[PDB]
Design an enzyme around this catalytic site. Structure first.
Site, mmCIF file in Angstrom:
data_model
loop_
_atom_site.group_PDB
_atom_site.id
_atom_site.type_symbol
_atom_site.label_atom_id
_atom_site.label_comp_id
_atom_site.label_asym_id
_atom_site.label_seq_id
_atom_site.Cartn_x
_atom_site.Cartn_y
_atom_site.Cartn_z
ATOM 1 N N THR I 1 0.818 -1.207 0.000
ATOM 2 C CA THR I 1 0.000 0.000 0.000
ATOM 3 C C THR I 1 0.853 1.260 0.000
ATOM 4 O O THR I 1 1.705 1.435 0.859
ATOM 5 C CB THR I 1 -0.954 0.029 1.211
ATOM 6 O OG1 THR I 1 -1.931 -1.009 1.070
ATOM 7 C CG2 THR I 1 -1.671 1.351 1.296
HETATM 8 B B1 LIG Z 1 -1.917 -2.155 1.923
HETATM 9 O O1 LIG Z 1 -1.178 -3.343 1.295
HETATM 10 O O2 LIG Z 1 -1.184 -1.920 3.251
HETATM 11 C C1 LIG Z 1 -3.372 -2.700 2.323
HETATM 12 C C2 LIG Z 1 -4.161 -1.547 2.924
HETATM 13 C C3 LIG Z 1 -5.611 -1.890 3.210
HETATM 14 C C4 LIG Z 1 -6.181 -0.915 4.222
HETATM 15 C C5 LIG Z 1 -6.425 -1.818 1.935
HETATM 16 N N1 LIG Z 1 -3.281 -3.781 3.285
HETATM 17 C C6 LIG Z 1 -3.168 -5.050 2.905
HETATM 18 O O3 LIG Z 1 -2.886 -5.359 1.763
HETATM 19 C C7 LIG Z 1 -3.381 -6.115 3.935
HETATM 20 C C8 LIG Z 1 -2.068 -6.839 4.180
HETATM 21 C C9 LIG Z 1 -1.027 -5.886 4.709
HETATM 22 C C10 LIG Z 1 0.116 -5.625 3.960
HETATM 23 C C11 LIG Z 1 1.078 -4.749 4.447
HETATM 24 C C12 LIG Z 1 0.897 -4.146 5.686
HETATM 25 C C13 LIG Z 1 -0.243 -4.412 6.438
HETATM 26 C C14 LIG Z 1 -1.207 -5.287 5.949
HETATM 27 N N2 LIG Z 1 -4.360 -7.083 3.492
HETATM 28 C C15 LIG Z 1 -5.197 -7.672 4.337
HETATM 29 O O4 LIG Z 1 -5.315 -7.306 5.491
HETATM 30 C C16 LIG Z 1 -6.016 -8.832 3.861
HETATM 31 C C17 LIG Z 1 -5.409 -10.059 3.636
HETATM 32 N N3 LIG Z 1 -6.152 -11.086 3.215
HETATM 33 C C18 LIG Z 1 -7.465 -10.944 3.006
HETATM 34 C C19 LIG Z 1 -8.078 -9.717 3.228
HETATM 35 N N4 LIG Z 1 -7.341 -8.687 3.652
#
Ligand SMILES: *[B]([O])([O])[C]([C][C]([C])[C])[N]C(=O)[C]([C]C1=[C][C]=[C][C]=[C]1)[N]C(=O)C1=[C]N=[C][C]=N1
Ligand SMILES: Cc1nc(C)c(C(=O)Nc2ccc(F)c(-c3nc4ncc(-c5ncccc5C)cn4n3)c2)o1
Ligand SMILES: *[B]([O])([O])[C]([C][C]([C])[C])[N]C(=O)[C]([C]C1=[C][C]=[C][C]=[C]1)[N]C(=O)C1=[C]N=[C][C]=N1
Ligand SMILES: *[B]([O])([O])[C]([C][C]([C])[C])[N]C(=O)[C]([C]C1=[C][C]=[C][C]=[C]1)[N]C(=O)C1=[C]N=[C][C]=N1
Ligand SMILES: *[B]([O])([O])[C]([C][C]([C])[C])[N]C(=O)[C]([C]C1=[C][C]=[C][C]=[C]1)[N]C(=O)C1=[C]N=[C][C]=N1
Lengths: 123, 214, 204, 201, 229, 218, 206, 219, 229
Positions: I1
């Site tokens: 993100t």
């Molecule tokens: B981004 O990659 O940080 C995103 C932001 C969210 C608010 C849309 N988060 C995610 O991709 C997260 C994983 C993550 C990555 C890096 C730091 C923190 C978290 N994804 C999930 O929480 C997720 C995983 N599997 C199913 C559904 N959601």
């Protein structure tokens, strides 16, 4: 280390270092043992009445086991090293087998040490 | 990282009066995937009369099959070409599993062969070499499905009925297909295709059979 | 583990117009036999018979709460409980205590008295509903029973020949399990009668 | 595994089960719990199945090499001391084996017991294994030194049976041996389920 | 630590900061992470200050004993296979990110990046250290290949200065040296003559209006700088 | 430095093998311009998924073994089935020394008609198939490779086996994090192993359900 | 577990025996402490365990049987009603704040007809219990370290038609085996018996 | 588990498998994973059978109870809000991955709910253990505005990527089509694994098992 | 993100990628991390996909219930104190990096960055997410304050494209929206029309010469692309 072959064969199939070791015994002191029905006697020569020898009487026939004793003939310095190998073997036997060692077992060990010095380098 | 990994599959054998039927499914799989469907590395030939049939970890399987392969060759060279019997190979197996007792193989073994009399006897092993001669044996992930099944139809126990006659090669083969079609239904790590080996005194014949692909 | 502390295996098969249910007779503390003449089956009416396995403290406490709730169901509703209503009732009981869960695994067998349809159900310890049309099994020898039941079942069985398959499946699986055995108590049940049979087994 | 052997006026009777279980799954039911070392010694097995069958095959090799070199039979006091020095040498290597040796040497009988930790004890009455604690109470009640040959075979076959009936790790086929002065003979070999309808008809 | 090495037509430009810091305290603010192996081959040096110093003077003794026995010049690919051999057979015991860059008459200017894993990759430019993660998006936008020697010096000094402005691990001086067919020319520019710093960056002059005066409206009017007004 | 997923398939006449040209370090994609397809001798090629330092030392060892056996003696070059066998016994030797070669590998090779395709793990597992995929291509790309070998048991031609690799590399760019859109394809045929110039795939990001107002969480 | 309880029922009596040892980790505090609590005139329980929960469980059971005789005009409840009230207190305590009772007990009793309309049990009652809440009616039950020595002894020698003296010399064999094999010094065993005339404290077997 | 969903021209199509395993052994071979929510809303489910069934029946009775009050057709966005607030307030302890499909007055609504409580509204979603192998079929063959037959075959060809490749999935393909007007649920749409080699059927005669006592109770 | 928000004279420009990834697998490649609170106040959204979605629709219901009772417009400082209150009293249980940016007629364009710790800082531009660490040295060099609306859109699209080229966590589409006195204008540019990518970056065209041919000299002559030559 030094392990050159000393006991080698003659051109007539004899071992010179064994035939010359037997000549060192034929100059040693005579020891006679005979076998009875209930007792074993062994008598040695006990070089001389030197009058300068200690009043503490020095035994020639050495104790090896509780019932197995030994008398030798040859070099008295080589025989002391041979017996302290056999006195070390009796305490190896009654630490691994819990038994008093037989007479025929101890002789197969001492003859095994005599043969092992006839087939070694530097020995 | 962990140096041990279970690769599924099962092996079963039923020994008769002058034959053994030896089977083992061809399915390799790892962590959560499926690596292959055609691995022939589950049953290994040592002599023309005695096989080994092992499973568990595929990497330590191939190492144990080679050290078993050359101890037979040093037997054949030092004895004037005399091929070792099943009893000689299966005691060789039982010792080498104990020589590596503290960093052992993750294999579960079966030595399968014929006797000096001609009768077939299968052996089984734990991870450290506990051997026993017995008339059948089933190892692998689906062992708890098939080993109670072979108790109920070979021993003929807890059934107040007279004994059937001796099983032929065909009635043993059709029986052993009912176990692998039963292990393909209820075990997720077992079954793509099972390969049947029929060890007789006049050589060995080899068959195949199809299981469920899921 | 806590689930295999007491020992005991309960299974059930489905037939044409009948079903069977069969438990062992062993109670124990992880290696030692406490009793040799203790079944695991429970009968609430002439159509539903269920069996509990797992921890014996929970096998008696849960079966008291079931009998508290089945007899209260008959006082409120002027009728016997049905199989689909009984199985969905104690599915809800194992889900209310999901974080303090009971260590039972109920094996429910039932039949319609007027229609003749069998209904099997075997939940997990957390109440996961699952209705196979062929057989259900729980207990310490449960992994040995999925091989015995699946290789011997067919859909069209008579009540006399369904007993012979379930009895040879329980005993051959208890000869490989060291926490189950010592004979077996079975119960075949049709639309017309309930027959309870005690089976010879190894005293090992 | 339940395994006992006792010493009386007439020799030593060894009595075992035949069951090997990996926790709650029974691996086999025809395990020979007695490894005969030679034609005048015996050895039993309890604990790890591979740890026993290896080192009592090593023990059967050191007893055969004794007769080749020294020309005579090995005693039982030397045979266990071979097995006890092996066992004490590997006491930190996680072995699990509890074995009794029994035989007729030139000093009568002797019945020993070797741990997996190097112990060796000399009594006339043992019972080893996980279901040994059931086999003591029926044996200590009916044991006496001057039993007959048939009654001591009956007491051993009946004391194994009450341990196989109660312990989950014991059972199968009760094997009874008898160590007299000429060697050992296999007395009986019978199923535990058949033995229930004899003792409680 | 922020280390980098960039190739131009003639040779290479090594660039590094000067700070060894025990976690949070500056033990040394005038470190020298540009280690001489031979006259024309240096190495940048990141990670453990002891584990990479012992490798750099063990390679430099194999490499000078090689040069005497050969009787010719040492290739840069020769020196980069002595770090790869040592950083791979010690990879569980050391912490070593090495950038080997130099000059040889056969291949010209060479850059080898040897990470903590022990691999060897020949590059056009290399980055290393904890402050290198700021410089990937800086070299994707502001770096064009094929600069001169005078342009690569002013670029790599401007590259390191953006790295230790954000990084807490890095800071201090900027030590650069060029390795080509001429004599090796070194240059150390200080902090107070660095080409970039956030304290004199004219967009960070206005304070973020955090400490609002106690007022009657939601109109944000800046910080409160006095007790009276 | 770590490599990503590697996929490979047999066709009528040879073996294809594709891999992205990326070498990531954790999440950071450090270098998008390194080749991972090494070719071995004159008939075979290997590529790895996992640690690059382990692959760079292992492939240096098994390339020295092919040439020195061929240079010193008057023998033929090793076949692909025999240099994969040396590749298998060298990885198993390293885990028994408690220092393994921590990567999955994909091996291809064609020697005068006899095509060879096999993979090997860090532990010592080896398998042969008509479709090998390691990394997250074993989860993503490998189901697509398996259906296209069974929808025609006569075999794939080179033209239709190149369509489905491009269909598999496109989904690896969609669904694997540590990947870029720059791929090299090795092609081992009866002429020998030939590595192609890096290309890219055509990606579609224009679905009407991907718009700002539908995917919004208001 | 260091102290054993041995109980077996016969045609017209129930024997119980519980070693009166109380210890502090190796130090013998007592040798004669009564561990067979007389609940009712025809009911008793032989609890084993450490002395903390053992008194506090038996006093809660005994005072509630007496309270249920106050509120019900002196009507003595059956032995199954007392035993099912006991395991309710074991099973509700393994899922509570204070924790499980570490008591192992053998319930014993004799069922008498309280009126002419009572057509219930006439014979003796003997119930095996546990610290978790297991309840099992059993011909003979045993706890402690020496339980496995004497449960297989009662596999050999117990008969359903034993008399008052033949079961008295059986319990003497039960007490002499625990003195022979168990390392824990159990020397005094407190043999009591439940018959149709109430409980009785047997002086002979100790 | 290999539950999928696909938005087509008018409505959505939900897909699922039938295998349910309890610890490496197949418990049930014909379990049902496409549940009922509303006359226009269905819901696939993965994870634990206890947690999936008990989050679905509670919300589907809450949507029915909320339908008697409004007297209108229930939204799929209110079916999603009741699911995501339940799965959030247990913080991933209710291990149920959900795929929610429906049709409202605003068109087809396909969205998934993670077991931690996050929601994603996409044209095509996959959940379960074989979700990775089923997504690669959808990423290679999905296109906008497919017919009912091309979407029903794309869904069924994505389940078989979890049947033949994921060991936790198989034995059948369940397909549920959700339209604006009707809803069609087929269970035996694609059975690729048939019964090869039917059973030998070892016959045992009635009475060959030894019985010690028997008690017959007429009704 | 990778999320960011940049202020110009009129209002603010929100910018974000589109990818939620469960560790290493792309669960969604068309996420929408730009969450509507009110008509002119949005928030960027990083971290846990469930923990930040539950906060964003709990604030947006307090914020619309406030707007009805007031009868006027909501200030951006009002919406940024409802995230700070919730991200601080849940800071040990959630993973939430929020960038709140919007427009109000009193203060114009406002940007509030609320990190995982729960603090609130009012800024000119904000960065957030795991891909934000690439963009500090990119905004130190290439960003000049005081751009127009059309220049901030093309800059923030060029800013995100450098972030998800190096980051493995980030990728997919680029979703931007502007919040000022006009209607909120959104724009989603794809990957294949992104303003930057390393695959078409003309300095990464030449492969790094790793796979040397077996030769007689140390002269490096590129990779080996064929079995014959
Ligand atoms: B981004 O990659 O940080 C995103 C932001 C969210 C608010 C849309 N988060 C995610 O991709 C997260 C994983 C993550 C990555 C890096 C730091 C923190 C978290 N994804 C999930 O929480 C997720 C995983 N599997 C199913 C559904 N959601
Ligand atoms: C002189 C003497 N007096 C006694 C009382 C003993 C004695 O008991 N000595 C002994 C020594 C070593 C052993 F290894 C064992 C032994 N026997 C076993 N039988 C079965 C299982 C088992 N089986 C299946 C599942 C789980 C388990 C734990 C484990 N063991 N361990 C027993 O010796
Ligand atoms: B008896 O139960 O002790 C038996 C005696 C042995 C000579 C057959 N032993 C076993 O059954 C042991 C139990 C065990 C004890 C200690 C540690 C681990 C296991 N089982 C085995 O050794 C075994 C394992 N696999 C197959 C056969 N036997
Ligand atoms: B640079 O900060 O990485 C530097 C490189 C070194 C080779 C000159 N390393 C150090 O500053 C290290 C600490 C460190 C920081 C970040 C990553 C790895 C290591 N300094 C020391 O090792 C040190 C600490 N105290 C005393 C002496 N040396
Ligand atoms: B999926 O694999 O088809 C399925 C989901 C459905 C049945 C709710 N999962 C299961 O099979 C689960 C176990 C599981 C496997 C992998 C990930 C998560 C969960 N099985 C059960 O919950 C179960 C257990 N016993 C009986 C019935 N169902």
């Amino acid at each position: 280390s030094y392990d050159r072959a000393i006991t080698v064969f003659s051109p007539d199939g004899h071992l010179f270092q064994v035939e010359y070791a037997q000549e060192a015994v034929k100059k040693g002191l005579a020891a006679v043992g005979v076998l009875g029905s209930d007792s074993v006697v062994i008598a040695v020569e006990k070089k001389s009445a030197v009058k300068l020898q200690d009043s503490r009487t020095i035994r020639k026939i050495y104790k090896v086991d509780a019932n197995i004793y030994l008398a030798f003939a040859g070099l008295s310095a080589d025989a002391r090293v041979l017996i302290n190998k056999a006195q070390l073997e009796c305490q190896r036997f009654s630490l691994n087998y819990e038994d008093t060692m037989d007479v025929d077992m101890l002789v197969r060990y001492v003859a095994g040490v005599q043969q092992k010095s006839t087939q070694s380098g530097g020995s | 990282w962990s140096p041990y990994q279970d690769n599924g599959g099962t092996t079963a054998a039923i020994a008769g009066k002058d034959f053994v039927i030896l089977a083992g499914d061809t399915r390799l799989n790892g962590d959560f995937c499926l690596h292959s469907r055609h691995d022939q590395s589950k049953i290994f030939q040592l002599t023309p009369y005695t096989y080994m049939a092992s499973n568990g970890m595929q990497a330590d399987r191939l190492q144990l099959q080679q050290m078993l392969k050359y101890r037979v060759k040093w037997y054949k060279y030092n004895n004037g070409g005399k091929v070792p019997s099943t009893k000689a190979i299966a005691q060789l197996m039982s010792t080498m599993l104990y020589h590596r007792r503290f960093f052992p193989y993750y294999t579960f073994n079966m030595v399968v062969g014929l006797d000096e009399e001609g009768h077939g006897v299968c052996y089984s092993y734990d991870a450290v070499g506990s051997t026993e001669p017995f008339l059948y044996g089933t190892r692998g992930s689906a062992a708890s499905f098939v080993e109670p099944l072979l108790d109920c139809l070979i021993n003929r126990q807890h059934m107040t009925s007279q004994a059937p006659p001796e099983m032929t090669k065909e009635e043993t083969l059709a029986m052993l297909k009912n176990a692998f079609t039963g292990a393909a239904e209820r075990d997720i790590y077992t079954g793509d295709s099972v390969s049947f080996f029929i060890i007789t005194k006049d050589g060995v014949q080899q068959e195949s059979f199809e299981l469920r692909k899921d | 583990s806590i689930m295999a502390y007491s020992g005991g295996s309960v299974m059930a098969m489905a037939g044409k117009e009948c079903f069977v249910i069969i438990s062992d007779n062993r109670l124990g503390e992880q290696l030692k036999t406490i009793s040799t003449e203790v079944p695991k089956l429970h009968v609430v009416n002439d159509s539903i018979v269920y069996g509990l396995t797992g921890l014996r403290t929970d096998q008696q406490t849960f079966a008291n709460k079931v009998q508290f709730r089945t007899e209260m169901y008959k006082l409120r509703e002027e009728r016997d409980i049905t199989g689909k209503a009984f199985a969905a009732m104690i599915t809800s009981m194992l889900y209310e205590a999901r974080f303090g869960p009971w260590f039972v695994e109920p094996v429910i067998g039932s039949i319609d008295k007027s229609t003749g349809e069998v209904y099997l159900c075997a939940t997990d310890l957390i109440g996961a509903p699952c209705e196979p049309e062929d057989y259900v099994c729980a207990g310490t020898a449960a992994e040995s029973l999925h091989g015995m039941c699946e290789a011997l079942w067919r859909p069209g069985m008579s009540p006399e020949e369904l007993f012979e398959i379930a009895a040879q499946a329980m005993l051959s699986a208890c000869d490989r399990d060291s926490l189950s055995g010592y004979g077996a108590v079975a119960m075949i049940v049709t639309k017309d009668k309930v027959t309870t049979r005690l089976i010879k087994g190894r005293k090992d | 595994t339940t395994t006992l052997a006792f010493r009386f006026n007439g020799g030593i009777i060894v009595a075992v089960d035949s069951r090997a279980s990996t926790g709650q799954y029974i691996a086999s039911q025809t395990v020979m719990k007695v490894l005969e070392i030679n034609d005048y010694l015996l050895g039993t097995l309890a604990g790890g199945a591979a740890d026993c069958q290896y080192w009592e095959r090593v023990l059967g090799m050191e007893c055969r090499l004794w007769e080749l070199r020294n020309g005579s039979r090995i005693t039982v006091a030397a045979a266990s001391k071979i097995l006890a020095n092996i066992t004490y040498a590997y006491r930190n290597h996680g072995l699990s084996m509890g074995t009794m040796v029994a035989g007729w040497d030139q000093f009568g009988p002797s019945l020993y017991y070797v741990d997996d930790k190097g112990s060796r004890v000399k009594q006339d009455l043992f019972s080893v294994g996980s279901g040994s604690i059931y086999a003591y109470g029926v044996l200590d009640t009916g044991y006496r030194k001057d039993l007959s040959v048939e009654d001591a075979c009956d007491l051993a076959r009946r004391s194994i049976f009450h341990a196989t009936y109660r312990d989950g790790a014991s059972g199968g086929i009760v094997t009874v041996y008898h160590v007299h002065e000429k060697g050992w003979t296999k007395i009986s070999r019978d199923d535990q389920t058949k033995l229930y309808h004899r003792y409680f008809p | 630590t922020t280390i980098l090495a960039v190739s131009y037509n003639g040779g290479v430009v090594l660039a590094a900061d000067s700070r060894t810091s025990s976690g949070t305290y500056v033990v040394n603010r005038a470190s020298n992470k540009l280690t001489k192996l031979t006259k024309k081959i240096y190495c940048c040096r990141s990670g453990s200050a002891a584990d990479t110093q012992a490798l750099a003077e063990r390679v430099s003794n194999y490499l000078g004993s090689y040069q005497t026995d050969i009787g010719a010049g040492v290739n840069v690919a020769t020196a980069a296979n002595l770090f790869q051999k040592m950083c791979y057979m010690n990879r569980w015991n050391i912490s070593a990110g090495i950038i080997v860059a130099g000059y040889d008459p056969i291949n010209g200017g060479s850059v080898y990046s040897i990470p903590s894993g022990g691999s060897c990759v020949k590059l056009d430019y290399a980055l290393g250290g904890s402050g290198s993660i700021f410089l990937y998006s800086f070299f994707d936008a502001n770096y064009k290949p094929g600069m001169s020697k005078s342009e690569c010096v002013a670029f790599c000094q401007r590259a390191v200065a953006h790295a230790y402005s954000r990084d807490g691990s890095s800071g201090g001086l900027i030590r650069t040296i060029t390795l080509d067919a001429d004599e090796p020319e070194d240059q150390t520019i200080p902090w107070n003559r660095s080409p970039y710093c956030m304290e004199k960056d004219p967009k960070y002059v206005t304070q973020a209006t955090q400490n609002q005066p106690f007022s009657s409206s939601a109109k944000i009017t800046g910080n409160r700088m006095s007790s009276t007004g | 430095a770590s490599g990503g997923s590697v996929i490979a398939i047999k066709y009528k006449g040879g073996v294809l093998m594709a891999a992205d040209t990326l070498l990531s370090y954790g999440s950071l994609a450090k270098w998008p311009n390194i080749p991972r397809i090494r070719l071995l001798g004159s008939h075979s090629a290997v590529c790895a998924t996992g640690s690059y330092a382990d692959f760079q030392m292992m492939a240096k060892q098994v390339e020295d073994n092919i040439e020195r056996q061929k240079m010193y003696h008057n023998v033929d070059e090793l076949s692909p089935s025999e240099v994969f066998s040396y590749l298998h016994r060298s990885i198993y030797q390293k885990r028994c020394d408690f220092d393994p070669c921590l990567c999955q590998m994909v091996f291809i090779g064609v020697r005068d008609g006899e095509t060879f395709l096999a993979g090997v793990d860090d532990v010592g597992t080896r398998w042969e198939d008509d479709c090998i995929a390691t990394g997250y291509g074993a989860y993503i790309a490998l189901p697509l490779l398996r259906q296209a070998l069974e929808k025609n048991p006569d075999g794939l031609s080179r033209g239709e086996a190149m369509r489905i690799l491009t269909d598999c590399l496109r989904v690896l760019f969609y669904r694997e994090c540590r990947a870029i859109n720059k791929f090299q394809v090795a092609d081992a045929a009866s002429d020998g192993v030939r590595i192609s110039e890096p290309f890219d795939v055509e990606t579609h990001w224009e679905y009407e359900g991907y718009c700002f107002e539908k995917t919004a969480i208001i | 577990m260091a102290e054993t309880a041995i109980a077996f029922r016969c045609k017209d009596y129930v024997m119980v025996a519980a070693a009166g040892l109380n210890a502090f980790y190796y130090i013998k505090i007592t040798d004669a402490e009564d561990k067979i609590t007389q609940l009712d005139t025809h009911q008793l329980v032989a609890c084993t365990g450490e002395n903390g929960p053992r008194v506090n469980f038996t006093e809660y059971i005994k005072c509630n049987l007496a309270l249920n005789r106050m509120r019900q005009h002196g009507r003595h409840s059956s032995c199954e009603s007392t035993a099912n009230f006991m395991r309710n207190c074991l099973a509700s305590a393994i899922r509570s704040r204070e924790g499980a009772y570490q008591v192992n007990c053998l319930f014993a009793g004799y069922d008498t007809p309280v009126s002419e309309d009572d057509d219930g049990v006439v014979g003796p009652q003997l119930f095996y219990m546990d610290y978790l809440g297991t309840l099992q009616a059993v011909p003979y039950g045993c706890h402690g370290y020496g339980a496995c020595f004497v449960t297989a002894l009662l596999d050999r020698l117990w008969r359903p038609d034993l008399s008052q003296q033949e079961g008295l010399e059986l319990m003497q064999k039960c007490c002499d085996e625990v003195k022979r094999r168990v390392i824990i010094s159990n020397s005094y065993f407190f043999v009591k018996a439940v018959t149709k005339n109430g409980v009785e404290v047997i002086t002979a077997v100790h | 588990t290999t539950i999928v969903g696909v938005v087509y021209r008018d409505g959505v199509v939900l897909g699922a498998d039938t295998r349910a395993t309890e610890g490496s052994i197949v418990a049930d071979k014909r379990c049902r994973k496409i549940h009922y929510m509303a006359p226009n809303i269905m819901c696939c489910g993965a994870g634990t059978s206890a947690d999936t069934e008990a989050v679905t029946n509670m919300v589907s009775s809450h949507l029915a109870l909320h339908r008697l009050e409004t007297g209108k057709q229930s939204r799929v966005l209110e079916a999603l809000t009741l699911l995501k607030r339940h799965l959030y307030r247990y913080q991933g302890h209710v291990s149920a991955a959900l795929v929610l499909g429906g049709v409202d007055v605003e068109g087809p609504f396909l969205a998934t709910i993670a077991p931690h409580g996050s929601t994603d509204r996409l044209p095509f979603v996959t959940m379960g253990s074989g979700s990775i192998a089923a997504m690669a079929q959808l990423e290679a063959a999905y296109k906008d505005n497919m017919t009912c037959e091309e979407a029903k075959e794309l869904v069924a060809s994505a389940i078989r990527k979890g049947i033949f490749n994921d060991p936790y999935s198989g034995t059948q393909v369940d397909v549920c089509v959700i339209t604006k007007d009707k809803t069609e649920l087929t269970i035996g749409y694609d059975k690729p694994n048939e019964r090869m080699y039917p059973r030998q059927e070892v016959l045992l005669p009635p009475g060959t098992t030894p019985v010690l006592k028997e008690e017959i109770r007429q009704l």
